Paper text:
We demonstrate that phosphorylated [name] and Ser448 are the key residues that facilitate 14-3-3 protein binding to [name] and that 14-3-3 protein binding induces a structural rearrangement of [name] by inhibiting interactions between its structured domains.
Because our AUC analysis suggested that the pSer342 and pSer448 motifs are responsible for high-affinity [name] binding to 14-3-3, we investigated the structural basis of their interaction with 14-3-3 in detail. The pep-S342 showed a measurable binding affinity only to 14-3-3σ (KD of ∼7.8 μM). The final electron densities of both peptides allowed us to trace seven of ten amino acids (Leu338 – Thr344) of pep-S342 and (Pro444 – Pro450) pep-S448. In both cases, we were unable to trace the last three residues of each peptide, presumably due to disorder. The pSer342 moiety of pep-S342 is coordinated through direct contacts enabled by side chains of the 14-3-3 residues Arg57, Arg132, Lys50 and Tyr133 and by water-mediated contacts with 14-3-3 Asp129 and Asn178. Other contacts include hydrogen bonds between the main-chain atoms of the [name] residues Cys341 and Val343 and the side chains of the 14-3-3 residues Asn229 and Asn178, respectively. In addition, the side chain of [name] Ser340 makes a polar contact with the side-chain residues Trp233 and Glu185 of 14-3-3.
Residue numbers in the entry:
A (entry chain A): 3 to 234
B (entry chain B): 3 to 70, 76 to 234
C (entry chain G): 339 to 344
D (entry chain E): 338 to 344
Write the structure that this text describes.
Amino acid sequence: DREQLVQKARLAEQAERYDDMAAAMKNVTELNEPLSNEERNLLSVAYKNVVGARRSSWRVISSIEQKTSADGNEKKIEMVRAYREKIEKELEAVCQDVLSLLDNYLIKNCSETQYESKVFYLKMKGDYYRYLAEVATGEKRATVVESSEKAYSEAHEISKEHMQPTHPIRLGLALNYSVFYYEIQNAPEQACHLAKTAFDDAIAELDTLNEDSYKDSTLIMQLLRDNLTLWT
Amino acid sequence: DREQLVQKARLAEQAERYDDMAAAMKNVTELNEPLSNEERNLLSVAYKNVVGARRSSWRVISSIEQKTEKKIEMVRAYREKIEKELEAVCQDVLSLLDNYLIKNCSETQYESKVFYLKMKGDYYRYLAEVATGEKRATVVESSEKAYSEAHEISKEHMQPTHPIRLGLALNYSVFYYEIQNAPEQACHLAKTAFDDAIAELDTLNEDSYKDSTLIMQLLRDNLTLWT
Amino acid sequence: RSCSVT
Amino acid sequence: LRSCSVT
Ligand SMILES: OC(C(F)(F)F)C(F)(F)F
Ligand SMILES: OC(C(F)(F)F)C(F)(F)F
Ligand SMILES: OC(C(F)(F)F)C(F)(F)F
């Protein structure tokens, strides 16, 4: 039953078993039925935690690899390198699973008028291609970087046309898109322009904040300001 | 390459990948040589974190099952899934203990003997936490037998201020209180250990004072909780 | 719950 | 610090 797969995902989240949570929401998605706002969040939370654990480990391993390389022990250097590659393979497999779900079920089943869902899922697509770009090199990197920008750009145009500036999905898309410009493309001026425009557009309509959007939107506004403070 | 397996366990710990850390230290153990104190602690830390994540998840699900019909049968099935995982972790540790670790203790490596027998009692206790009925009674007896063997060695050979002797008393008393539901035995064991260690607290160095007083605080906190 | 070795 | 994304 679908209601049992979703309740199992809710159980797995409370028990902090995010692999189980992602597997349950992956099964719900493959039922080829649309996800509710809550089911969409369950899927996003699960895979963010699954991929986030690998990203966190990858950063620590990469930092240790730099120190190890300077000390010049080739056996230890090769051990750390192989362990980074092992984590990179796991992260890439997680990203491919999400991206497959997005392209084959989630983005596909969006009706012409489901703008919020389309922006959410296209933003997710840009996010997981960005996570691939974080650990890719060479020609494999340029490809996923180009796929990340294509997904973010399409999400941005739909969001600008159809969504309010204080909507958390529109704000969150701008935040992550600006991070993509800064960290992945190394385009600080583009990053700053997008973050600053989205920030002011929302501030201009702060009175439109509702009880369901206030916490989420103002948190993202704070993060836009924090990034802008850091990048300038 | 032993030294490289140990480095991998250290690397996994920093990456917070404790299943990888346990796999590395399991590989070190299967080399069939006595573990150094450093290796012994890495093995213990690894499996403590692996089984501890399952214990924490089980307690969340078990509370949900109690506090919460079609949803109930799903909660019970999910709890059993976690139980099977936890029981497989304990099975691997107990097999390492019975086939390598306890076996490879020399006749007079009493510190390691107490450490590993206490560990054996711990992991049978974790099995008992999730068992019912006749299966529960079996692992409860195994846990008690291991703790008791560790206790007799610890009393004969270690001083009351030794952190392993104190930690054995702490966990053994928790076994009495939480598993056997024998709070009088639990209280007597914890109080005796605390009082017998008080005698030689002035003799300890700065390092030993910290490790021993830490466990004495846990003994004291348990005793106040129980009364 | 009671505390074991931490 | 590092750049922050949606949390
Ligand atoms: O919101 C504005 C911006 F964009 F942050 F500068 C103002 F500074 F005017 F508040
Ligand atoms: O707080 C800043 C200000 F002052 F509004 F310009 C920022 F642009 F960073 F939001
Ligand atoms: O220092 C002793 C101790 F450790 F507090 F028990 C004395 F009993 F002397 F206070």
